[PDB]
Amino acid sequence: PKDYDELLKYYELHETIGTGGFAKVKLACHILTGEMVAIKIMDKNTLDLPRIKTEIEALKNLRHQHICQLYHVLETANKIFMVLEYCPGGELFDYIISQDRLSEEETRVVFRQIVSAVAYVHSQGYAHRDLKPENLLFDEYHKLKLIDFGLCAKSLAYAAPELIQGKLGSEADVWSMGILLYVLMCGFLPFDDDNVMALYKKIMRGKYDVPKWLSPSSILLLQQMLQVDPKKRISMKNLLNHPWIMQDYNYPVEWQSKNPFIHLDDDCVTELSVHHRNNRQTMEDLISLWQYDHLTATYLLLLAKKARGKPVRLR
Ligand SMILES: COC(=O)c1ccc2c(c1)NC(=O)/C2=C(\Nc1ccc(N(C)C(=O)CN2CCN(C)CC2)cc1)c1ccccc1
Ligand SMILES: [Cl-]
């Protein structure tokens, strides 16, 4: 109750919109902007504590069009709150359930965004190591956003044989994306079993069912991504411009950030200094501290307004 006092200053909390084992996420409204945000809540006491320093510091160093944006971090005696970009389209998994499976054309659209995000994550020196439809969300634009960076440093169905054997984090994400590709185009996992060691065994053998509806080029790509030997596996580089990926596009995956923090935004800075009745130069400095506090939150949520073609205005 007193743990939520600091948060409730800045946000109107709505329902729990989801709950994994490690954290609960609530929908909320940022009071100063009216912007919807997802707030991941973690109990420090009943927790795996390294998992959230991993995620927060990863998110501070990752700014990308298909990575879920962090805004505000609040730590209390008993809680850690992470205010994040709200993605109303929900999990990719649920879209794959409602449609039985995606067509090759629709899969490619979706998959190029995943390859974009993961390729960027690798460019910054990280490896996600937990890639699956549950960890990809559709934003308001029906564009994908990658989430849950708790295992990415410098699921077993999606885990690569080397990663389970504990021997190469970049090649393991390629494997996981192979499983993801398969799920998108088939509607089920290529390796699956109710017994965890039997699933393990299937993964090591590398043999899977190849449904009739798949094209020969899809099957080739799956065969290249799901090599048990990571040396034989296709690298991230040649994934970006693979003939299958290029189909209907004819350019490689644009993996670079289209929203890199170059300088600041003057329209956001002015509205803050105007709304708070502060010296403009002083407002430029406190934003530039980048503490991921309520001020950082307000600035970043005003960029979000600009990014969606809306006026940068507080109330
Ligand atoms: C690093 O990033 C993260 O760690 C992270 C993790 C999760 C989310 C996130 C960031 N950002 C989000 O938005 C997240 C979720 N968002 C969501 C969106 C839509 C739904 N769905 C499908 C609803 O139907 C909810 N819907 C109900 C009706 N009311 C009126 C509106 C809200 C459910 C969850 C979500 C959270 C928990 C688990 C799964 C996903
Ligand atoms: Cl692209």
Side-chain angles (χ1 to χ4, degrees):
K2 254 64 214 69
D3 294 296
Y4 289 75
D5 198 78
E6 189 61 45
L7 195 74
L8 287 165
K9 288 178 188 174
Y10 310 123
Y11 305 93
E12 302 286 2
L13 297 180
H14 299 288
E15 75 267 39
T16 300
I17 57 171
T19 163
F22 298 90
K24 295 190 181 293
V25 189
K26 312 198 86 186
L27 180 60
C29 181
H30 183 247
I31 293 163
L32 272 191
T33 56
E35 290 284 308
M36 291 306 99
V37 293
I39 302 173
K40 194 139 85 170
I41 311 185
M42 283 134 296
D43 197 74
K44 295 159 71 180
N45 303 323
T46 62
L47 202 60
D48 304 304
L49 191 67
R51 215 190 206 274
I52 76 201
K53 298 202 196 84
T54 305
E55 184 164 25
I56 291 164
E57 296 303 320
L59 288 168
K60 286 179 184 167
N61 297 310
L62 294 164
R63 164 62 175 184
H64 197 247
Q65 63 265 21
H66 298 295
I67 287 169
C68 191
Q69 188 54 42
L70 177 69
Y71 302 128
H72 195 170
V73 181
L74 304 83
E75 175 167 26
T76 70
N78 299 307
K79 304 288 188 181
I80 292 281
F81 299 95
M82 288 166 61
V83 186
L84 295 153
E85 186 181 349
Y86 172 58
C87 292
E91 295 188 349
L92 171 63
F93 187 51
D94 300 324
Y95 193 75
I96 296 168
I97 295 163
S98 51
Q99 323 275 103
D100 288 26
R101 49 164 196 282
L102 306 190
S103 75
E104 224 157 85
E105 285 64 40
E106 192 179 13
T107 303
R108 189 178 298 106
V109 169
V110 165
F111 195 71
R112 284 175 64 95
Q113 300 175 57
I114 293 155
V115 172
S116 178
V118 176
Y120 169 77
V121 163
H122 292 195
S123 87
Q124 299 298 109
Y126 296 96
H128 197 265
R129 301 162 58 208
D130 200 1
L131 299 163
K132 47 175 170 188
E134 290 89 334
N135 292 327
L136 286 142
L137 309 179
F138 283 111
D139 71 11
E140 60 213 303
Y141 296 93
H142 212 75
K143 288 284 196 288
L144 272 178
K145 292 274 161 70
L146 189 58
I147 57 152
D148 291 0
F149 296 83
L151 292 168
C152 85
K154 283 173 160 156
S155 85
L156 198 285
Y158 295 86
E162 337 89 71
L163 196 68
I164 313 165
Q165 295 264 91
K167 300 215 289 276
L168 307 173
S170 182
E171 301 94 323
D173 285 349
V174 172
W175 171 279
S176 299
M177 286 187 304
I179 304 299
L180 233 169
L181 185 65
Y182 189 99
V183 171
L184 290 161
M185 298 193 297
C186 307
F188 51 89
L189 290 160
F191 310 107
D192 198 15
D193 206 289
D194 297 309
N195 180 19
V196 73
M197 292 304 306
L199 176 52
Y200 204 132
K201 195 196 167 192
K202 288 170 191 283
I203 291 158
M204 301 316 296
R205 276 183 291 185
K207 311 302 177 196
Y208 53 88
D209 181 84
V210 182
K212 66 184 187 275
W213 56 78
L214 295 182
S215 70
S217 185
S218 300
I219 291 160
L220 186 59
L221 178 59
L222 288 159
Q223 192 184 123
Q224 288 171 287
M225 293 185 87
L226 302 174
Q227 288 296 308
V228 168
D229 190 345
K231 297 174 285 183
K232 300 206 81 198
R233 199 174 305 152
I234 193 174
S235 58
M236 188 64 67
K237 179 223 158 199
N238 298 306
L239 196 64
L240 298 169
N241 63 353
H242 192 263
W244 189 91
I245 292 286
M246 299 282 269
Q247 184 77 30
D248 304 337
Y249 276 80
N250 317 133
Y251 60 104
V253 173
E254 297 183 337
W255 62 268
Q256 294 174 85
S257 180
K258 294 169 156 64
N259 59 344
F261 293 125
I262 299 164
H263 307 313
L264 306 93
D265 192 78
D266 300 327
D267 306 8
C268 294
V269 172
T270 189
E271 184 57 31
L272 289 160
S273 68
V274 166
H275 184 268
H276 298 298
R277 305 207 233 288
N278 279 3
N279 188 295
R280 186 180 165 77
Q281 177 52 41
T282 306
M283 190 61 73
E284 287 182 53
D285 293 344
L286 296 166
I287 294 161
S288 298
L289 293 172
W290 282 105
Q291 301 191 255
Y292 284 86
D293 63 323
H294 169 67
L295 186 52
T296 308
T298 318
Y299 171 76
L300 289 167
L301 292 164
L302 289 180
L303 279 168
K305 276 174 148 53
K306 172 172 281 202
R308 305 203 313 281
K310 306 312 305 296
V312 177
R313 291 287 181 282
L314 299 164
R315 213 162 198 182

